[PDB]
Amino acid sequence: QTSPPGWRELVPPDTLHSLPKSQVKRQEVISELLVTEAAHVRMLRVLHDLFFQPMAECLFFPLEELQNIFPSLDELIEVHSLFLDRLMKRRQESGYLIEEIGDVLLARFDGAEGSWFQKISSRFCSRQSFALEQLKAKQRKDPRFCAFVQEAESRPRCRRLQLKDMIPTEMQRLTKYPLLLQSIGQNTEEPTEREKVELAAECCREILHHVNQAVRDMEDLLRLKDYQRRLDLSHLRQSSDPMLSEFKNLDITKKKLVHEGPLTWRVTKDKAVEVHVLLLDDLLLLLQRQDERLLLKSHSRTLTPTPDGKTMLRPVLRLTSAMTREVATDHKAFYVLFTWDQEAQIYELVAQTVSERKNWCALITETAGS
């Protein structure tokens, strides 16, 4: 009733049957734009009003964490909400059919206004996994919270909407914009009006592009905070080994994550160690899962346990000096050779397939020599 009527529902029948096919298609897609945006704002309003802002009062989450689950949603609303008021104005101004939409599209998606929409949008969409993982966990562990969400969901304003389905929506909408603008354009007739829209259609294409990378950017930055938190550096601390003096004091959250994978580390003929490996921008970490913790151990290359003397293999490795080779003896495995001023030692890693060693080798060579 309140959600705006479409177009195809109020256009008078004599107007409809008199227009070019291109033009009814154009009118329809404008209407879809207008309606879906009006549906989008409404939704974001529900998320703020029924979920975010009550949780902030009930403190299920430290506000820091909360604000990180609904990143400046307060402003996401405004950005979308005002863009709609503009759409709504044009429809208002022009009854029957709307010619000219381009200038609205640019007022939201261009230059400065374009950047601001991007920035707010980026904030929200990028923490999407986190918000989901965090919400799902709490709701599955704290029954006060689940009662909270169900009560929230039973509300009249929350009809047709679900908490778990609302969060990814913003990502999806950015995916629709370039589909809809492109479409309006293909069917715009009047020369100069169309060129606007095509370029509105380009801003969105860039925005989607940007925000998609922004996402792999968080999905990765957090993935490291999470290894930083799980890390145990007590072996590196208690080491007199000089190749490990820099790492005492080790903070991988600032660095770039290039690649990661489970591999098997053959430290001897007779000793293999399951490891989770991080190829950072300049380091190669050999992490051993031990319970909830991630562990950095030097291992002896002397297959006798354990009189001693020789230098041990090391879990953290500077890439500067690296070289990779196929392990002849076992097609699935590979050597990484390091060379420092004192010595040269080699590290044997086994992978799950011929195709996945090839991948590590190329990455290590590509990352190292860079």
mmCIF file of C-alpha atoms in Angstrom:
data_model
loop_
_atom_site.group_PDB
_atom_site.id
_atom_site.type_symbol
_atom_site.label_atom_id
_atom_site.label_comp_id
_atom_site.label_asym_id
_atom_site.label_seq_id
_atom_site.Cartn_x
_atom_site.Cartn_y
_atom_site.Cartn_z
ATOM 1 C CA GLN A 1 0.000 0.000 0.000
ATOM 2 C CA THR A 2 2.731 2.471 1.205
ATOM 3 C CA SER A 3 5.584 1.156 -1.035
ATOM 4 C CA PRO A 4 5.125 3.305 -4.212
ATOM 5 C CA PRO A 5 3.027 2.010 -7.137
ATOM 6 C CA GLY A 6 5.075 0.839 -10.101
ATOM 7 C CA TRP A 7 4.290 2.648 -13.357
ATOM 8 C CA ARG A 8 3.001 -0.104 -15.334
ATOM 9 C CA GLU A 9 0.135 0.255 -12.818
ATOM 10 C CA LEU A 10 -0.809 3.831 -13.077
ATOM 11 C CA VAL A 11 0.115 4.788 -16.669
ATOM 12 C CA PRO A 12 -3.246 5.357 -18.513
ATOM 13 C CA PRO A 13 -3.926 2.705 -21.089
ATOM 14 C CA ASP A 14 -3.874 5.075 -24.033
ATOM 15 C CA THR A 15 -0.421 6.361 -23.182
ATOM 16 C CA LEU A 16 0.991 2.784 -22.900
ATOM 17 C CA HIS A 17 -0.299 1.565 -26.262
ATOM 18 C CA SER A 18 0.998 4.631 -28.003
ATOM 19 C CA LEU A 19 4.688 4.465 -26.993
ATOM 20 C CA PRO A 20 7.743 2.843 -28.726
ATOM 21 C CA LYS A 21 8.919 -0.518 -27.271
ATOM 22 C CA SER A 22 12.237 1.099 -26.239
ATOM 23 C CA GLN A 23 10.304 3.701 -24.284
ATOM 24 C CA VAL A 24 8.068 1.432 -22.249
ATOM 25 C CA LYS A 25 11.240 -0.495 -21.440
ATOM 26 C CA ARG A 26 12.892 2.717 -20.378
ATOM 27 C CA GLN A 27 9.935 3.765 -18.196
ATOM 28 C CA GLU A 28 9.794 0.363 -16.551
ATOM 29 C CA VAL A 29 13.443 0.296 -15.583
ATOM 30 C CA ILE A 30 13.281 3.769 -14.117
ATOM 31 C CA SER A 31 10.285 2.560 -12.093
ATOM 32 C CA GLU A 32 12.165 -0.592 -10.970
ATOM 33 C CA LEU A 33 15.025 1.659 -9.924
ATOM 34 C CA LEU A 34 12.682 3.953 -7.972
ATOM 35 C CA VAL A 35 10.710 1.153 -6.236
ATOM 36 C CA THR A 36 13.650 -1.090 -5.308
ATOM 37 C CA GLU A 37 15.419 1.927 -3.859
ATOM 38 C CA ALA A 38 12.395 2.853 -1.902
ATOM 39 C CA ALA A 39 12.425 -0.793 -0.723
ATOM 40 C CA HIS A 40 16.056 -0.639 0.059
ATOM 41 C CA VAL A 41 15.864 2.438 2.262
ATOM 42 C CA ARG A 42 12.905 1.036 4.156
ATOM 43 C CA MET A 43 15.005 -2.020 4.872
ATOM 44 C CA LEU A 44 18.113 -0.268 6.022
ATOM 45 C CA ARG A 45 15.751 1.813 8.258
ATOM 46 C CA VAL A 46 14.506 -1.402 9.808
ATOM 47 C CA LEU A 47 17.997 -2.681 10.422
ATOM 48 C CA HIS A 48 18.970 0.511 12.174
ATOM 49 C CA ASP A 49 15.774 0.955 14.129
ATOM 50 C CA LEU A 50 15.017 -2.636 15.155
ATOM 51 C CA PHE A 51 18.443 -4.189 15.421
ATOM 52 C CA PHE A 52 21.442 -1.901 15.619
ATOM 53 C CA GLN A 53 20.099 0.802 17.900
ATOM 54 C CA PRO A 54 18.447 -1.517 20.383
ATOM 55 C CA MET A 55 21.497 -3.667 20.683
ATOM 56 C CA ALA A 56 23.515 -0.532 21.479
ATOM 57 C CA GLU A 57 21.156 0.081 24.397
ATOM 58 C CA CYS A 58 20.975 -3.603 25.537
ATOM 59 C CA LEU A 59 24.811 -3.908 25.216
ATOM 60 C CA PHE A 60 25.151 -7.465 23.871
ATOM 61 C CA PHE A 61 28.224 -6.031 22.225
ATOM 62 C CA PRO A 62 30.906 -3.648 23.318
ATOM 63 C CA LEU A 63 30.076 -0.572 21.197
ATOM 64 C CA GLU A 64 33.434 -0.764 19.402
ATOM 65 C CA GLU A 65 32.489 -4.253 18.193
ATOM 66 C CA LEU A 66 28.882 -3.183 17.463
ATOM 67 C CA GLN A 67 29.921 -0.233 15.357
ATOM 68 C CA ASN A 68 32.110 -2.723 13.499
ATOM 69 C CA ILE A 69 29.083 -4.946 12.753
ATOM 70 C CA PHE A 70 26.954 -2.145 11.344
ATOM 71 C CA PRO A 71 29.711 0.239 10.112
ATOM 72 C CA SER A 72 28.261 3.817 10.086
ATOM 73 C CA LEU A 73 24.978 2.420 8.951
ATOM 74 C CA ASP A 74 23.577 5.607 10.356
ATOM 75 C CA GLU A 75 25.057 7.291 7.344
ATOM 76 C CA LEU A 76 24.448 4.511 4.818
ATOM 77 C CA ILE A 77 20.828 5.256 5.336
ATOM 78 C CA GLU A 78 21.186 8.962 4.640
ATOM 79 C CA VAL A 79 23.135 8.461 1.425
ATOM 80 C CA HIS A 80 20.542 6.057 -0.074
ATOM 81 C CA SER A 81 17.628 7.885 1.637
ATOM 82 C CA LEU A 82 18.291 11.193 0.080
ATOM 83 C CA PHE A 83 19.003 9.702 -3.390
ATOM 84 C CA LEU A 84 15.487 8.291 -3.241
ATOM 85 C CA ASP A 85 13.890 11.602 -2.290
ATOM 86 C CA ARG A 86 15.418 12.799 -5.576
ATOM 87 C CA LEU A 87 13.969 9.941 -7.576
ATOM 88 C CA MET A 88 10.671 10.518 -5.802
ATOM 89 C CA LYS A 89 10.787 14.221 -6.729
ATOM 90 C CA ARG A 90 11.255 13.519 -10.463
ATOM 91 C CA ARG A 91 8.285 11.094 -10.549
ATOM 92 C CA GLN A 92 6.339 13.682 -8.540
ATOM 93 C CA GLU A 93 7.314 16.495 -10.901
ATOM 94 C CA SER A 94 6.543 14.494 -13.940
ATOM 95 C CA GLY A 95 3.413 12.372 -13.955
ATOM 96 C CA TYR A 96 2.431 9.783 -16.664
ATOM 97 C CA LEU A 97 5.967 9.225 -17.873
ATOM 98 C CA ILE A 98 9.420 10.432 -16.831
ATOM 99 C CA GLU A 99 11.851 11.745 -19.434
ATOM 100 C CA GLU A 100 15.272 12.644 -18.093
ATOM 101 C CA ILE A 101 16.838 10.783 -15.132
ATOM 102 C CA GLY A 102 20.533 11.188 -15.860
ATOM 103 C CA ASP A 103 21.181 14.209 -13.670
ATOM 104 C CA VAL A 104 19.840 12.394 -10.603
ATOM 105 C CA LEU A 105 22.090 9.400 -11.278
ATOM 106 C CA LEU A 106 25.141 11.724 -11.399
ATOM 107 C CA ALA A 107 24.055 13.603 -8.293
ATOM 108 C CA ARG A 108 24.402 10.347 -6.370
ATOM 109 C CA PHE A 109 27.134 8.424 -8.143
ATOM 110 C CA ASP A 110 29.496 11.163 -9.476
ATOM 111 C CA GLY A 111 32.735 12.915 -8.438
ATOM 112 C CA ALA A 112 32.544 13.917 -4.788
ATOM 113 C CA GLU A 113 28.979 12.617 -4.136
ATOM 114 C CA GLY A 114 30.219 9.519 -5.983
ATOM 115 C CA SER A 115 33.216 9.173 -3.692
ATOM 116 C CA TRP A 116 31.143 9.643 -0.507
ATOM 117 C CA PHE A 117 28.637 7.000 -1.563
ATOM 118 C CA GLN A 118 31.558 4.768 -2.358
ATOM 119 C CA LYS A 119 33.247 5.349 0.933
ATOM 120 C CA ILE A 120 30.155 4.693 3.112
ATOM 121 C CA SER A 121 29.141 1.752 0.982
ATOM 122 C CA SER A 122 32.660 0.355 1.168
ATOM 123 C CA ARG A 123 32.593 0.505 5.004
ATOM 124 C CA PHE A 124 29.413 -1.455 5.309
ATOM 125 C CA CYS A 125 29.777 -4.188 2.622
ATOM 126 C CA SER A 126 33.310 -5.057 3.620
ATOM 127 C CA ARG A 127 32.538 -6.184 7.135
ATOM 128 C CA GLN A 128 29.728 -8.404 5.856
ATOM 129 C CA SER A 129 31.199 -11.794 6.675
ATOM 130 C CA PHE A 130 32.229 -10.551 10.104
ATOM 131 C CA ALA A 131 28.794 -9.193 10.931
ATOM 132 C CA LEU A 132 27.283 -12.485 9.848
ATOM 133 C CA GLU A 133 29.823 -14.668 11.692
ATOM 134 C CA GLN A 134 29.540 -12.561 14.815
ATOM 135 C CA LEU A 135 25.788 -12.366 14.836
ATOM 136 C CA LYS A 136 25.287 -16.054 14.049
ATOM 137 C CA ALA A 137 27.663 -17.066 16.870
ATOM 138 C CA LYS A 138 26.149 -14.940 19.610
ATOM 139 C CA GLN A 139 22.639 -15.962 18.606
ATOM 140 C CA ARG A 140 23.713 -19.621 18.744
ATOM 141 C CA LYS A 141 25.353 -19.260 22.121
ATOM 142 C CA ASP A 142 23.375 -16.643 24.114
ATOM 143 C CA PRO A 143 19.696 -17.280 24.436
ATOM 144 C CA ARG A 144 19.015 -13.726 25.653
ATOM 145 C CA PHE A 145 20.318 -12.646 22.320
ATOM 146 C CA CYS A 146 18.347 -15.113 20.277
ATOM 147 C CA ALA A 147 15.235 -14.115 22.151
ATOM 148 C CA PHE A 148 16.247 -10.603 21.246
ATOM 149 C CA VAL A 149 16.459 -11.309 17.513
ATOM 150 C CA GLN A 150 13.209 -13.336 17.350
ATOM 151 C CA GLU A 151 11.303 -10.619 19.096
ATOM 152 C CA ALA A 152 12.846 -8.100 16.795
ATOM 153 C CA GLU A 153 11.838 -10.275 13.818
ATOM 154 C CA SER A 154 8.181 -10.786 14.917
ATOM 155 C CA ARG A 155 7.558 -7.055 14.640
ATOM 156 C CA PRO A 156 5.226 -5.657 12.035
ATOM 157 C CA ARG A 157 7.972 -3.499 10.492
ATOM 158 C CA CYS A 158 10.074 -6.621 10.030
ATOM 159 C CA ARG A 159 7.584 -8.453 7.822
ATOM 160 C CA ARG A 160 9.275 -10.066 4.712
ATOM 161 C CA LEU A 161 12.766 -9.188 6.184
ATOM 162 C CA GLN A 162 15.240 -11.295 8.151
ATOM 163 C CA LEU A 163 18.247 -10.210 10.095
ATOM 164 C CA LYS A 164 20.539 -12.702 8.433
ATOM 165 C CA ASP A 165 19.235 -11.677 4.986
ATOM 166 C CA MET A 166 19.431 -7.936 5.486
ATOM 167 C CA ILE A 167 23.172 -7.644 5.935
ATOM 168 C CA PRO A 168 24.338 -8.906 2.519
ATOM 169 C CA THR A 169 21.732 -6.785 0.750
ATOM 170 C CA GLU A 170 23.891 -3.732 0.356
ATOM 171 C CA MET A 171 26.443 -5.721 -1.562
ATOM 172 C CA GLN A 172 23.649 -7.089 -3.816
ATOM 173 C CA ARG A 173 22.263 -3.629 -4.514
ATOM 174 C CA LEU A 174 25.583 -2.396 -5.758
ATOM 175 C CA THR A 175 25.494 -5.334 -8.100
ATOM 176 C CA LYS A 176 22.105 -4.284 -9.449
ATOM 177 C CA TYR A 177 22.932 -0.569 -10.088
ATOM 178 C CA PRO A 178 25.086 -1.137 -13.142
ATOM 179 C CA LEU A 179 22.529 -3.638 -14.491
ATOM 180 C CA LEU A 180 19.724 -1.138 -14.186
ATOM 181 C CA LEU A 181 21.542 1.970 -15.355
ATOM 182 C CA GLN A 182 23.046 0.145 -18.362
ATOM 183 C CA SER A 183 19.494 -0.921 -19.144
ATOM 184 C CA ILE A 184 17.934 2.550 -18.830
ATOM 185 C CA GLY A 185 20.736 3.839 -21.116
ATOM 186 C CA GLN A 186 20.308 1.240 -23.925
ATOM 187 C CA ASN A 187 16.751 2.563 -24.191
ATOM 188 C CA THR A 188 17.293 6.218 -23.738
ATOM 189 C CA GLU A 189 16.504 8.005 -27.008
ATOM 190 C CA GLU A 190 17.420 11.675 -26.685
ATOM 191 C CA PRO A 191 21.238 11.921 -27.425
ATOM 192 C CA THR A 192 22.667 14.036 -24.493
ATOM 193 C CA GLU A 193 20.410 12.698 -21.752
ATOM 194 C CA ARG A 194 21.648 9.150 -22.596
ATOM 195 C CA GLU A 195 25.380 10.038 -22.304
ATOM 196 C CA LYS A 196 24.826 11.181 -18.697
ATOM 197 C CA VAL A 197 23.215 7.859 -17.792
ATOM 198 C CA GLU A 198 25.974 5.849 -19.491
ATOM 199 C CA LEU A 199 28.442 7.668 -17.293
ATOM 200 C CA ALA A 200 26.271 7.248 -14.183
ATOM 201 C CA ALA A 201 26.346 3.596 -15.313
ATOM 202 C CA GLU A 202 30.126 3.785 -15.398
ATOM 203 C CA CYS A 203 30.535 5.275 -11.883
ATOM 204 C CA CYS A 204 28.553 2.425 -10.404
ATOM 205 C CA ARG A 205 30.612 -0.122 -12.392
ATOM 206 C CA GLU A 206 33.742 1.381 -10.686
ATOM 207 C CA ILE A 207 32.079 1.523 -7.327
ATOM 208 C CA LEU A 208 31.156 -2.195 -7.508
ATOM 209 C CA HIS A 209 34.719 -2.836 -8.646
ATOM 210 C CA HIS A 210 36.160 -0.850 -5.759
ATOM 211 C CA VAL A 211 33.939 -2.178 -3.040
ATOM 212 C CA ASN A 212 34.518 -5.790 -4.249
ATOM 213 C CA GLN A 213 38.268 -5.385 -3.655
ATOM 214 C CA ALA A 214 37.595 -3.479 -0.378
ATOM 215 C CA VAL A 215 35.913 -6.684 0.712
ATOM 216 C CA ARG A 216 38.803 -9.054 -0.139
ATOM 217 C CA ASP A 217 40.772 -6.362 1.731
ATOM 218 C CA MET A 218 38.936 -6.818 5.047
ATOM 219 C CA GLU A 219 38.373 -10.592 4.532
ATOM 220 C CA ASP A 220 42.176 -10.635 4.522
ATOM 221 C CA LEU A 221 43.126 -8.021 7.130
ATOM 222 C CA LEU A 222 40.972 -9.724 9.689
ATOM 223 C CA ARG A 223 42.212 -13.132 8.717
ATOM 224 C CA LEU A 224 45.634 -11.925 9.926
ATOM 225 C CA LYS A 225 44.455 -10.214 13.128
ATOM 226 C CA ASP A 226 43.166 -13.653 13.777
ATOM 227 C CA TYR A 227 46.491 -15.314 13.234
ATOM 228 C CA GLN A 228 48.194 -12.552 15.262
ATOM 229 C CA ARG A 229 45.872 -13.258 18.189
ATOM 230 C CA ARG A 230 46.424 -17.047 17.975
ATOM 231 C CA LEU A 231 50.206 -16.790 17.565
ATOM 232 C CA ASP A 232 52.651 -18.066 20.153
ATOM 233 C CA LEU A 233 56.036 -16.450 20.034
ATOM 234 C CA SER A 234 57.570 -18.048 23.080
ATOM 235 C CA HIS A 235 59.937 -20.197 21.035
ATOM 236 C CA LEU A 236 61.219 -17.255 19.056
ATOM 237 C CA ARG A 237 61.554 -15.321 22.333
ATOM 238 C CA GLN A 238 63.704 -18.012 23.994
ATOM 239 C CA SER A 239 65.942 -18.416 20.954
ATOM 240 C CA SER A 240 69.594 -17.413 20.677
ATOM 241 C CA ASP A 241 69.363 -18.095 16.907
ATOM 242 C CA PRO A 242 70.454 -15.036 14.955
ATOM 243 C CA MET A 243 68.150 -15.627 11.896
ATOM 244 C CA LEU A 244 65.336 -15.065 14.428
ATOM 245 C CA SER A 245 66.528 -11.893 16.178
ATOM 246 C CA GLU A 246 64.179 -9.610 14.193
ATOM 247 C CA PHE A 247 61.126 -11.639 15.101
ATOM 248 C CA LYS A 248 60.529 -11.107 18.739
ATOM 249 C CA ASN A 249 58.250 -8.787 18.494
ATOM 250 C CA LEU A 250 56.400 -9.981 15.468
ATOM 251 C CA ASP A 251 53.331 -8.404 14.080
ATOM 252 C CA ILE A 252 51.939 -9.669 10.912
ATOM 253 C CA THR A 253 48.808 -7.494 10.864
ATOM 254 C CA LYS A 254 50.564 -4.666 9.136
ATOM 255 C CA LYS A 255 51.999 -6.820 6.315
ATOM 256 C CA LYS A 256 50.282 -7.984 3.106
ATOM 257 C CA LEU A 257 48.961 -11.506 2.812
ATOM 258 C CA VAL A 258 49.859 -12.992 -0.500
ATOM 259 C CA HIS A 259 48.804 -16.613 -0.102
ATOM 260 C CA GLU A 260 48.046 -19.310 2.433
ATOM 261 C CA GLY A 261 47.633 -23.079 2.434
ATOM 262 C CA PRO A 262 48.006 -26.223 4.416
ATOM 263 C CA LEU A 263 51.192 -28.035 3.519
ATOM 264 C CA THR A 264 53.350 -30.813 4.942
ATOM 265 C CA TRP A 265 56.863 -29.941 5.983
ATOM 266 C CA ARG A 266 59.368 -32.702 5.683
ATOM 267 C CA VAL A 267 62.037 -31.659 8.131
ATOM 268 C CA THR A 268 63.766 -35.034 7.811
ATOM 269 C CA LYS A 269 63.401 -38.302 6.031
ATOM 270 C CA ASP A 270 61.587 -39.478 9.173
ATOM 271 C CA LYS A 271 59.833 -36.360 10.434
ATOM 272 C CA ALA A 272 56.973 -34.550 8.759
ATOM 273 C CA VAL A 273 54.908 -31.804 10.268
ATOM 274 C CA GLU A 274 51.509 -30.590 9.229
ATOM 275 C CA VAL A 275 51.681 -26.805 8.758
ATOM 276 C CA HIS A 276 49.607 -23.895 7.745
ATOM 277 C CA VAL A 277 51.760 -21.621 5.576
ATOM 278 C CA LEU A 278 51.614 -17.811 5.102
ATOM 279 C CA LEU A 279 53.370 -16.285 2.200
ATOM 280 C CA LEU A 280 53.435 -12.701 3.375
ATOM 281 C CA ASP A 281 54.709 -9.817 1.165
ATOM 282 C CA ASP A 282 58.312 -10.554 2.392
ATOM 283 C CA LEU A 283 58.074 -13.440 4.938
ATOM 284 C CA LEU A 284 57.202 -17.090 4.853
ATOM 285 C CA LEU A 285 55.719 -18.374 8.063
ATOM 286 C CA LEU A 286 55.487 -22.064 8.857
ATOM 287 C CA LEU A 287 52.643 -22.343 11.367
ATOM 288 C CA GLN A 288 51.829 -25.398 13.376
ATOM 289 C CA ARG A 289 48.261 -25.665 14.679
ATOM 290 C CA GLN A 290 48.293 -26.725 18.287
ATOM 291 C CA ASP A 291 44.792 -26.545 19.730
ATOM 292 C CA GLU A 292 43.271 -23.109 19.182
ATOM 293 C CA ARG A 293 46.882 -21.693 18.918
ATOM 294 C CA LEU A 294 49.297 -21.176 16.046
ATOM 295 C CA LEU A 295 52.885 -22.052 16.744
ATOM 296 C CA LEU A 296 56.383 -21.150 15.398
ATOM 297 C CA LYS A 297 59.031 -23.833 16.117
ATOM 298 C CA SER A 298 62.474 -24.451 14.814
ATOM 299 C CA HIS A 299 63.070 -28.103 14.064
ATOM 300 C CA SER A 300 66.344 -29.966 14.001
ATOM 301 C CA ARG A 301 67.484 -31.351 10.657
ATOM 302 C CA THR A 302 69.547 -33.940 12.548
ATOM 303 C CA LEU A 303 67.338 -37.071 12.343
ATOM 304 C CA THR A 304 68.944 -38.379 15.498
ATOM 305 C CA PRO A 305 67.105 -37.123 18.510
ATOM 306 C CA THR A 306 69.206 -35.727 19.832
ATOM 307 C CA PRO A 307 72.876 -35.117 20.711
ATOM 308 C CA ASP A 308 73.018 -31.819 18.549
ATOM 309 C CA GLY A 309 75.375 -29.235 16.889
ATOM 310 C CA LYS A 310 74.028 -28.169 13.482
ATOM 311 C CA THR A 311 71.713 -25.247 12.841
ATOM 312 C CA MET A 312 68.016 -25.833 12.824
ATOM 313 C CA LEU A 313 65.307 -25.173 10.259
ATOM 314 C CA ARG A 314 63.235 -22.093 10.959
ATOM 315 C CA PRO A 315 59.479 -21.338 10.951
ATOM 316 C CA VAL A 316 59.941 -17.721 9.880
ATOM 317 C CA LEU A 317 61.913 -17.006 6.716
ATOM 318 C CA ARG A 318 62.849 -13.820 4.891
ATOM 319 C CA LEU A 319 62.008 -14.099 1.246
ATOM 320 C CA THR A 320 64.819 -11.903 -0.092
ATOM 321 C CA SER A 321 67.141 -14.918 -0.512
ATOM 322 C CA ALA A 322 64.662 -17.476 -1.814
ATOM 323 C CA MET A 323 64.622 -19.806 -4.832
ATOM 324 C CA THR A 324 62.103 -22.604 -5.513
ATOM 325 C CA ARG A 325 62.471 -25.983 -7.180
ATOM 326 C CA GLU A 326 60.284 -28.971 -8.103
ATOM 327 C CA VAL A 327 61.140 -31.929 -5.912
ATOM 328 C CA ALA A 328 62.118 -34.561 -8.418
ATOM 329 C CA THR A 329 61.838 -37.492 -5.874
ATOM 330 C CA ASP A 330 58.134 -36.755 -5.133
ATOM 331 C CA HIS A 331 56.245 -34.945 -7.885
ATOM 332 C CA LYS A 332 53.822 -33.459 -5.347
ATOM 333 C CA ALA A 333 56.490 -31.769 -3.159
ATOM 334 C CA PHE A 334 58.934 -28.817 -3.529
ATOM 335 C CA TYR A 335 62.203 -27.284 -2.251
ATOM 336 C CA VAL A 336 62.703 -23.718 -1.104
ATOM 337 C CA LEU A 337 66.367 -22.800 -0.844
ATOM 338 C CA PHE A 338 67.446 -19.895 1.344
ATOM 339 C CA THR A 339 70.917 -18.271 1.301
ATOM 340 C CA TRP A 340 72.207 -16.043 4.103
ATOM 341 C CA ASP A 341 75.677 -14.672 4.635
ATOM 342 C CA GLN A 342 76.650 -17.670 6.799
ATOM 343 C CA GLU A 343 74.906 -20.657 5.326
ATOM 344 C CA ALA A 344 72.465 -22.019 2.859
ATOM 345 C CA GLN A 345 69.666 -24.316 3.967
ATOM 346 C CA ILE A 346 66.810 -25.954 2.147
ATOM 347 C CA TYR A 347 63.112 -26.529 3.132
ATOM 348 C CA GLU A 348 60.927 -29.390 1.776
ATOM 349 C CA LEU A 349 57.200 -28.776 1.462
ATOM 350 C CA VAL A 350 54.645 -31.300 0.176
ATOM 351 C CA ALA A 351 51.360 -30.242 -1.334
ATOM 352 C CA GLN A 352 47.993 -31.845 -2.032
ATOM 353 C CA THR A 353 48.404 -31.933 -5.794
ATOM 354 C CA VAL A 354 50.867 -31.374 -8.627
ATOM 355 C CA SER A 355 48.762 -28.357 -9.551
ATOM 356 C CA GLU A 356 49.053 -26.676 -6.134
ATOM 357 C CA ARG A 357 52.862 -26.887 -5.773
ATOM 358 C CA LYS A 358 53.170 -25.245 -9.191
ATOM 359 C CA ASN A 359 51.085 -22.503 -7.609
ATOM 360 C CA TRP A 360 53.214 -21.967 -4.503
ATOM 361 C CA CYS A 361 56.428 -21.963 -6.588
ATOM 362 C CA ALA A 362 55.229 -19.271 -8.918
ATOM 363 C CA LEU A 363 53.953 -17.278 -6.023
ATOM 364 C CA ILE A 364 57.122 -17.567 -4.031
ATOM 365 C CA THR A 365 59.249 -16.633 -6.993
ATOM 366 C CA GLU A 366 56.894 -13.818 -7.917
ATOM 367 C CA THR A 367 56.786 -12.477 -4.375
ATOM 368 C CA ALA A 368 60.496 -12.949 -3.559
ATOM 369 C CA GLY A 369 62.372 -11.410 -6.470
ATOM 370 C CA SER A 370 59.892 -8.447 -6.441
#
